[PDB]
Amino acid sequence: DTKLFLSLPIDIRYTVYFFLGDVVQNVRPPAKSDIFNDELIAYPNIREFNQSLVDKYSKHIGVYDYIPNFIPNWCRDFDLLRHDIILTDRLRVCLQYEEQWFSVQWIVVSGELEIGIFTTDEQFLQVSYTINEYCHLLSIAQQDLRLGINVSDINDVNELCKEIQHRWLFDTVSYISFINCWDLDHENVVSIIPCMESFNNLHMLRIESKNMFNNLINTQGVRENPGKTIVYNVRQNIFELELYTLRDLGYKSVVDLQKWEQLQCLSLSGCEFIDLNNLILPQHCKMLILKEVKYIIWWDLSHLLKRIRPQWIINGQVKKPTKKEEEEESEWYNLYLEVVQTYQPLNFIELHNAKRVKGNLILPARLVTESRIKISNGTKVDSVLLI
Amino acid sequence: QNVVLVSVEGERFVVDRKIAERSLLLKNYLQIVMPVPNVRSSVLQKVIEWAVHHKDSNFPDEDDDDSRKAAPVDPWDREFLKVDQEMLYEIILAANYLNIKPLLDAGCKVVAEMIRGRTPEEIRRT
Amino acid sequence: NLYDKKLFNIWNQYERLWIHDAFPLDVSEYNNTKDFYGYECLFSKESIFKILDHSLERLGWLYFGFFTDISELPYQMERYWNEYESMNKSADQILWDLVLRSVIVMTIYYMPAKSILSLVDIDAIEKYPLELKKKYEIFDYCLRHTLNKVLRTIFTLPPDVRTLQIFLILSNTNFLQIYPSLGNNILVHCIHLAKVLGIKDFKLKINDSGSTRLQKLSMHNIWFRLSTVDYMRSSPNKIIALHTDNSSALTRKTLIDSIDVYDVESNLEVLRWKITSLDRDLEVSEPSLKTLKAMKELLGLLDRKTSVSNDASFNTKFESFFLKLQCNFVMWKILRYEFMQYGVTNGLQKLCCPARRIIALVANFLKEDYFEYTTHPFCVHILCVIAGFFSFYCIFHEADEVRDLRNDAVGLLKLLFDPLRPVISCFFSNLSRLEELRHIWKSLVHPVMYVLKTDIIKLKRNLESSDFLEVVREFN
Amino acid sequence: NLYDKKLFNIWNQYERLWIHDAFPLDVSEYNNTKDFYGYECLFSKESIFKILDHSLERLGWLYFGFFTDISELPYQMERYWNEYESMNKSADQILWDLVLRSVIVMTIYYMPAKSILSLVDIDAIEKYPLDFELKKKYEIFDYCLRHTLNKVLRTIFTLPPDVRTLQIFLILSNTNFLQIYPSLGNNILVHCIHLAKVLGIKDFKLKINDSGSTRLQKLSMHNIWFRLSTVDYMRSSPNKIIALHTDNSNLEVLRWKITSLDRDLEVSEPSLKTLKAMKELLGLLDRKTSVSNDASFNTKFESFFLKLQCNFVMWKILRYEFMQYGVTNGLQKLCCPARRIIALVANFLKEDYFEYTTHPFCVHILCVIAGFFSFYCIFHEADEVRDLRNDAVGLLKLLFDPLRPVISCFFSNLSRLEELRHIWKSLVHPVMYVLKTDIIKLKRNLESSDFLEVVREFN
Amino acid sequence: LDSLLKELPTRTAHLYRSIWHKYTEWLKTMPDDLKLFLSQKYIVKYIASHDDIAKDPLPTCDAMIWFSRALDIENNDVLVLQQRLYGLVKLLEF
């Protein structure tokens, strides 16, 4: 029941909702691969379907509108999902720890602002709520929040948010997302680049396409377009970073980001090829997060593997005890220091299942004894050794 | 080897030692009898029934969230837990006390199934 | 429950002001104060050599961590003895003199009574001012003499690393909890010397000789012990600090010369600093809950790495003891924060267990005749805070578990501790005061919590039947 | 000319390493070494009161700026004399004792020789070591100083935190002290900085309905904190790295502002609108400076020091300009500030105030000026600069006993640099190559190239 | 082929399939097999009826191109068609 469930502590509800990640609606759209299959699941359903919301919110919903009765389903879903105390504790608690589950940002429809709470993968909408409703449910503040650009939210809507958080309100928002609009064009960049001045709560960015990345980020493609790129003062104020969704990152690429300074954490997901030998970085950024991709090409570490003797090798680990053999001891430290200098600006490396790494893993023991090097069971490698 | 366990009522149940070293709170508390505060008799009976049904079984981790949400609701468990809500919640709290995670995960799985296979009328009462 | 959270905040401030609880003001009183150190003064050459033997046997930990080679020390010792005999100056000789003297004083603080009492001379007792009380009085005399000598030769000196060692060698004593303002000031001077010498260049470079490696190692151990004390001894009397120049081991999400960790080395000084940084992140910075989850996981891992240390000699038991002590203490602080703020269930029992572990440990170290090792001030700080909170929640609520644990702690601490008489006495008197407060509350903005509001106000201004309630207030 | 800009930066670093340029070990040689202060010892209390009269007449500036009330000082003096007489302790009394001693020592540093020589006793000169002029005066001054320092080193650590220690240090900074016993001074500076941050002296933010005593307290706190930041910038070689001048961003404010312009000059982003704004602002502050009108000795002294700071910083700014961006006529527009400085020191000689010239800041100033002037005199020709440099060096040799080692060292290395003129007189030149070697020699001392190395070895 | 279909964003692709459905239905309005479906005649007839799609015909035409190259069509055909289509978007966007 409800109050029995609410007489309970927080870890219980947390794990429960972790199992209920984000399915609050009674429906779900598919991925892309399941589109061309003509199989539609089933949604034969009926009225209590007001023409106040299907007409309003269609910019994020009416894209689909091609299946068994979905919108009346969606409509009554949005209706009944304004009173789930289930959901209110869901959000009080998910906010308490981390909202990696619900992606929660600003929106405007009809010129009326609201706060929408979506999936993360591409942010299919689930519901939204008013600011005053939201912070009557909770405490009002400059509660940091998220934002992203769609073909729904591009320029004037976007500039409407800008001028609203100027005139009516203040810029309570941090994090920016580039989920579509891969062209660097049709008014998104034109709107946003002059608009990152009242925009000083943030450190965090999310990126989608190799076109947009290569033509905005990878600083070898140097130009003199001032409004087409960032002002460098924000390039200081971006301690975090995220990016997804490309095929060939570093195959003979120009991978280098020294301008992208005062960065402190990188996140990468959903790609199909990568090599780290092309990769170049600033300092200050050691947190590296990497999610399900295809086979990775580790650093070379070949010459250094040729430097090695089985004088010491045991169990995949090594050490010189002999102080007398400064020959071997200095060699050991030279080896270890070359090793870390390959990974020099890195201390934490996370992998979800990427199915393969090809590049002769030899790592330090200080970090794998701990959980710095945090691989899932992408266990298709054997050339492991530790120092 | 075996160990006695005091249901806080005062009931001196007994377990095989290592089969209880399955648990982790025990595995630390020992490193023969132990107390068990705020637990009841049928509670611990059904607890050990699950614990004995799941002895040689394999469980992924307490960090592999993908394997975790990979959600095979065990059928033996699924029928085994077809009971009311208060005893259920007590089982859940006891699992929290004991650091025995997969049972807790299964309990939350079933409760999620309860609040997923729902009716609007549950809300129309509200 | 919200009342519980609020009074637990009050207990946070009250523990700060708990812990914020003679010396002549003129060195010239010790202008002519004799010694303990001449051939005929108090301590024969041979007694001193025996002291060093016991020190290297039992308590290598400290100075092993600092220096490069340690046969160096007896070498310099005998050389100094020869030079003293020939004389019936320089910087090196006086520095080494101070070094050996401080080493000795540490060893005195961590010696058994009967031994030292057998070693010491006799008629010199007639010469000097005069069980454990004799041991501690002679220790204090030696301390004050060393302090005179070292204050002078500290100021009037070039900057050399070894001065730092002195302070670190002496911090593991009653000193800083008996001469606090002095200690804080000299700590500031040592901090200046630290940043002077670039000892942050333990960044181990390529193609460096073993000597260079050992130099950087010594620098590294020094730096981390220094950051440990500088956090641990950071009351508002001090505002200058060095514990900011390191960085948390937490791998946060929300966020140069500022040194990071996991990138350097693995010597357990690092481990202590990590644990201290976790305590720091708990106290001053953003308290979250996923934060605590990660901290707790990491600390369980580090407790594993702690117990990996295997019994083979006294110093090893000592180190592993102190590490497990710190780990369980920090776990206790975290779980306190949890059960105080957000009321997760069973945390109280899983909190009581750490206390029982601590107490089993100190019981083992009494029963094994290692009571001298117990005398480290951190242990006493620990028991202080534990007895404090246990008395608090024992008077506000009833649990015979809590009563038993608190009674064990306080019976232990009273029955066993002369050394830190001022601190323990202040704590004991105010603790008995809080017991009378138990009688009060046993006989809701309660007048008792209002009295504690008055108490924190008294303290904050000490920085720079309500009739009967005020009556008992005046009574205590 | 780009070569000129680069070598001007090189001269900047070489001047940096210039300005980054016995007292015993165990404080026990001076355990029982004689006072000057006793009734029979050296100085006769009434003479001391006369000394205090002379101090309060001419030099209120320093201690007037610090304390609240100053009849306090003769009051405490007479109290200690009575107590000394009654004695034939506490913290307050010892602080006040040291305070008056340091006050006196400042007065000694700013007294004429013949006067004090008339004051001092005679058989007490027989009691003590001689040097028998100014050399005698400076030896007795040094003895007094070292005695005071013995006294204060012991008694610094063993005390509660009280403001007056700071006062001691500030009273003693206006001397040869810090440029003759630098490391000592730096450590005590660190301790005083700790005391500064302890007491929350950044709460000079003056609030509403505070009493006049409270206003004076906050004013004292304000002046002190800002004087501390002044010294903490001026005396910040790599021997010290802890600092308070980072915490920044009544004419004490004005002096701190001038120091902040010097700081922004040295360390941070050089732009051009920046310099334009700074120079206008400093002219504005010269207006605010000349608002002060000549009416008494301390006033002439203060306005002198302020105008000195203003012209010195303008000279540095305009140097920075003409080195980095090469505007024309700047050499002459830079020489004029020097002439203003020199008219000032001329005024203070002709008025028989040569003792006031002996402030170490003036000597640091003349040092850097003669340095840069010699540089551009040997690398380039302008009889104006040559004449001024000759005036400066003849002045500094002929006039200055106190800072004997430093000026002499500077003079000797300066005379060495005249031979370097002959070298350059006899294009990545070997002379600039020699200056690369020289800055490398100094930086590593911190922690026909054949003939060029030959003359290098000769010197 | 299918990789080329995978190359795109997701909102756009869902939109594309919805429009495939819409155009299939509006062709079921008439009796009448893929270029006849994606016929310039029938497409412009659809657009003449669907002036609403003339307000956002950019992905309309781009999807028509994407299908005209999806299956086995000569690449010259789809690009001369694309020239016609750029003529059309120039005609109608003003």
Contact D20, D137 (CB under 8 A): no
Q: Alpha-carbon distance D372 to D319, whole Å? A: 10
Residues of C in contact with B93 (CB under 8 A): 345-346
DSSP output for E27-93: HHTS----TTTT-HHHHHHHHHH-TTGGGS-HHHHHHHHHHHTTSS--HHHHHHHHHHHHHHHHHHH
> Distance from B1 to chain A by nearest Cα, in Å?
33
Which helix (H) or strand (E) covers residue C452, if one does?
A: helix C447-463
From A282, D344, A200, select the one nearest C256 (Cα to Cα): A282
Q: What angle do CA E59, E60, E62 make, to 5 degrees?
A: 60
Which helix (H) or strand (E) covers residue C372, if one does?
A: helix C371-374
Q: Alpha-carbon distance B64 to B70, whole Å? A: 10
Q: What angle do CA A26, A91, A57 make, to 5 degrees?
A: 50
> Distance from B97 to chain C by nearest Cα, in Å?
6
Query: Tell me, what DSSP letter sits at residue D200?
Result: T
Residue C345 and residue B96: Cβ atoms within 8 Å?
A: yes
A287 close to C (CB below 8 A)? yes
The sign of the dihedral angle between the CA atoms of D379, D383, D385, D387 is positive
Q: Alpha-carbon distance D56 to D79, whole Å? A: 19
C-alpha distances out from residue D147 to D125, D150, E22, Å = 16, 5, 101
Contact A96, A102 (CB under 8 A): no
Residues of A in contact with E14 (CB under 8 A): 29, 32, 35, 63-64
Query: Tell me, what DSSP letter sits at residue C29?
Result: G
Q: Alpha-carbon distance D219 to A254, whole Å? A: 60
Say which residues have a Cβ less than 8 Å from residue E53's Cβ, sequence separation at least 6: E19, E46, E47, E60
Q: Alpha-carbon distance C107 to C59, whole Å? A: 8
Chain E: residue whose CA lies nearest to A208: E9
From D259, D260, D258, select the one nearest D286 (Cα to Cα): D258
Chain A: residue whose CA lies nearest to B92: A12
Chain C: residue whose CA lies nearest to B97: C346
Which helix (H) or strand (E) covers residue D333, if one does?
A: helix D330-350
Chain A: residue whose CA lies nearest to E15: A63
Contact A105, A148 (CB under 8 A): yes
The sign of the dihedral angle between the CA atoms of D396, D401, D403, D405 is positive
Give the 3-state secondary structure percentages of chain D, helix then strand then coil, rounded to 5: 70, 0, 30
Q: Alpha-carbon distance D330 to D313, whole Å? A: 15
In DSSP terms, which residues pair with A176 in a beta bridge?
Answer: A147, A205
SS (H, E, C) D101-121: HHHHHHHHHCCCHHHHHHHCC
Enter the tokens of residue C178. 């008996």
Q: Which of C299, C346, C349, C401 to mutate to test the interface with B (most CBs of B within 10 A)?
A: C346
Chain E: residue whose CA lies nearest to A271: E7
Q: Alpha-carbon distance D204 to D367, whole Å? A: 36
Enter the tokens of residue D342. 């020199």
Q: Nearest CB to D158: which of C26, C89, C238?
A: C26
Q: Alpha-carbon distance C329 to C358, whole Å? A: 8
Enter the tokens of residue D167. 């006062």
| Alpha-carbon radius of gyration of chain B | 16
Query: Tell me, what DSSP letter sits at residue A310?
Result: T
From D71, D119, D171, D47, select the one nearest D79 (Cα to Cα): D71
Half-sphere exposure of B64 (CA within 13 A, CB side): 13
Contact A68, A52 (CB under 8 A): no
Q: Alpha-carbon distance A261 to A218, whole Å? A: 13
Q: Alpha-carbon distance D346 to D308, whole Å? A: 13
C-alpha distances out from residue A324 to A317, A319, A327, C67, Å = 21, 14, 8, 19
Residue B96 and residue C353: Cβ atoms within 8 Å?
A: no
Contact D396, D414 (CB under 8 A): no
C-alpha distances out from residue B74 to B40, B65, C252, Å = 25, 18, 37
Which helix (H) or strand (E) covers residue C447, if one does?
A: helix C447-463
DSSP output for A137-202: HS--S----EEEE-SSSSSHHHHHHHHHHHHTS-----EEEE-S-TTS-TTHHHHHGGG-SS--S-
Q: What angle do CA C254, C257, C260 make, to 5 degrees?
A: 50
CB atoms within 10 A of CB E7: 10
In DSSP terms, which residues pair with A113 in a beta bridge?
Answer: A108
* CB burial readout D365-397, b (16+ within 10 A) else e: bbbbbbbbbbbbbbbeeeeebeebbeebbebbe
SS3 at position B82: coil
Chain C: residue whose CA lies nearest to A98: C290
Q: What sections of D235-251 are H helices per DSSP?
A: none
Q: Alpha-carbon distance D251 to D306, whole Å? A: 9
Q: What type of residue sits at position C366?
A: L
Distance between alpha carbon D71 and the CA centroid of its chain, in Å?
28
The sign of the dihedral angle between the CA atoms of D213, D219, D223, D225 is positive
Chain C: residue whose CA lies nearest to A336: C206
In DSSP terms, which residues pair with A243 in a beta bridge?
Answer: A207, A268
DSSP output for A332-356: HHHHHHHHHHHTTT-SEEEE---S-
Contact D106, D177 (CB under 8 A): no
Enter the tokens of residue D28. 């026990």
> Distance from A20 to chain B by nearest Cα, in Å?
7
B96 close to C (CB below 8 A)? yes
Residue A32 and residue E12: Cβ atoms within 8 Å?
A: no
Residues of A in contact with C206 (CB under 8 A): 334, 337-338, 341
From edge to edge, which strands make up the β-sheet containing B11-16? B11-16, B2-7, B33-36
Q: Alpha-carbon distance D167 to D67, whole Å? A: 8
Contact C159, C196 (CB under 8 A): yes
Resolution given for this structure, in angstroms: 4.1
Q: Alpha-carbon distance D265 to D243, whole Å? A: 18
Q: Alpha-carbon distance A280 to A342, whole Å? A: 11
From B87, B105, B84, select the one nearest B96 (Cα to Cα): B105
Half-sphere exposure of C98 (CA within 13 A, CB side): 27
| Alpha-carbon radius of gyration of chain A | 25
**CA-CA-CA-CA torsion for C278, C284, C289, C290, nearest 10 degrees?**
-50
Q: Alpha-carbon distance E49 to A53, whole Å? A: 26
Q: Alpha-carbon distance E74 to E70, whole Å? A: 11
The sign of the dihedral angle between the CA atoms of D187, D191, D194, D195 is negative
Q: Nearest CB to D27: which of C152, C182, C185?
A: C152
Contact D129, D164 (CB under 8 A): no
Enter the tokens of residue D458. 């000769």
Contact C42, C120 (CB under 8 A): yes
From the number of C-beta atoms within 10 Å of its C-beta (0-12, 13-18, 19+), residue D211 rates as exposed
Q: Alpha-carbon distance A283 to A266, whole Å? A: 12
Contact A29, E14 (CB under 8 A): yes
In DSSP terms, which residues pair with A148 in a beta bridge?
Answer: A177
**CA-CA-CA-CA torsion for C158, C164, C170, C174, nearest 10 degrees?**
100
Residues of B in contact with A4 (CB under 8 A): 85-86, 89
What are the boundaries of each domain within chain D? Answer: 1-21+250-447, 22-249
> Distance from B36 to chain A by nearest Cα, in Å?
20
Enter the tokens of residue B16. 């095989």
Residues of C in contact with A333 (CB under 8 A): 204, 208, 213
- The residues in E 50-69 lying below 8 A from A, measured between CB atoms, are none
Kind of pairing between the strands at B33-36 and A175-178: unpaired
Contact C237, C17 (CB under 8 A): no
Which residues in chain E have their C atom more than 2.5 Å from the N of the next written residue, marking a break after them? Answer: 32
Half-sphere exposure of C351 (CA within 13 A, CB side): 21
A23 close to B (CB below 8 A)? yes
From C48, C49, C23, C25, select the one nearest C35 (Cα to Cα): C48
Class of domain E2-93: mainly alpha
Q: Alpha-carbon distance C394 to D261, whole Å? A: 61
Enter the tokens of residue D136. 């005698």
A21 close to B (CB below 8 A)? yes
Residue E11 and residue A122: Cβ atoms within 8 Å?
A: yes
Q: Alpha-carbon distance D46 to C437, whole Å? A: 63
Report residue A350: phi and psi, to 5°. -110, 135
Q: Alpha-carbon distance C2 to A121, whole Å? A: 39
Contact A117, A60 (CB under 8 A): no
Query: Tell me, what DSSP letter sits at residue A270?
Result: S
Enter the tokens of residue D64. 């007037």
Kind of pairing between the strands at A287-290 and A265-268: parallel
Residue D242 and residue C195: Cβ atoms within 8 Å?
A: yes
Residue A80 and residue B123: Cβ atoms within 8 Å?
A: yes
| Alpha-carbon radius of gyration of chain C | 24
- The residues in A 203-242 lying below 8 A from C, measured between CB atoms, are 203, 239-240
B73 close to A (CB below 8 A)? no
Contact D342, D370 (CB under 8 A): no
> Distance from D242 to chain C by nearest Cα, in Å?
7
Say which residues have a Cβ less than 8 Å from residue E78's Cβ, sequence separation at least 6: E65, E68, E69
Give the 3-state secondary structure percentages of chain A, helix then strand then coil, rounded to 5: 25, 15, 55
Report residue D54: phi and psi, to 5°. -60, -35
A40 close to B (CB below 8 A)? no
Say which residues have a Cβ less than 8 Å from residue A331's Cβ, sequence separation at least 6: A307
User: What is the widest separation between alpha-carbon atoms in chain D?
Assistant: 78
DSSP output for C130-172: ---HHHHHHHHHHHHHHHHHHHHHHHTS---THHHHHHHHHHS
A76 close to B (CB below 8 A)? yes
Query: Tell me, what DSSP letter sits at residue B4?
Result: E
Counting other chains too, the contacts that D336-340 makes at CB distance below 8 Å and 24 or more residues apart are: D337/D311, D337/D312, D338/D369, D338/D373, D338/D388, D339/D388, D340/D307, D340/D311
Q: Do chains D and A touch (3 or more CB pairs under 8 A)?
A: no
SS3 at position A126: strand
Enter the tokens of residue D324. 């980095």
Tell me which residue has tokens 């092309």: A278
CB atoms within 10 A of CB C155: 21
Contact A103, A120 (CB under 8 A): yes
Q: Which overall architecture, per CATH, does domain B1-126 show?
A: 2-Layer Sandwich (3.30)
Q: Alpha-carbon distance A91 to A86, whole Å? A: 9
From A46, A129, A125, A117, select the one nearest A82 (Cα to Cα): A129
Residue A83 and residue B66: Cβ atoms within 8 Å?
A: no
Contact D215, D423 (CB under 8 A): no
D235 close to C (CB below 8 A)? no
| Alpha-carbon radius of gyration of chain E | 13
Q: Alpha-carbon distance D225 to D222, whole Å? A: 5
Q: Alpha-carbon distance C19 to C13, whole Å? A: 10
C-alpha distances out from residue C428 to C18, C335, C371, C413, Å = 11, 26, 21, 10
From the number of C-beta atoms within 10 Å of its C-beta (0-12, 13-18, 19+), residue D144 rates as buried
From A240, A254, A255, A244, select the one nearest A288 (Cα to Cα): A240
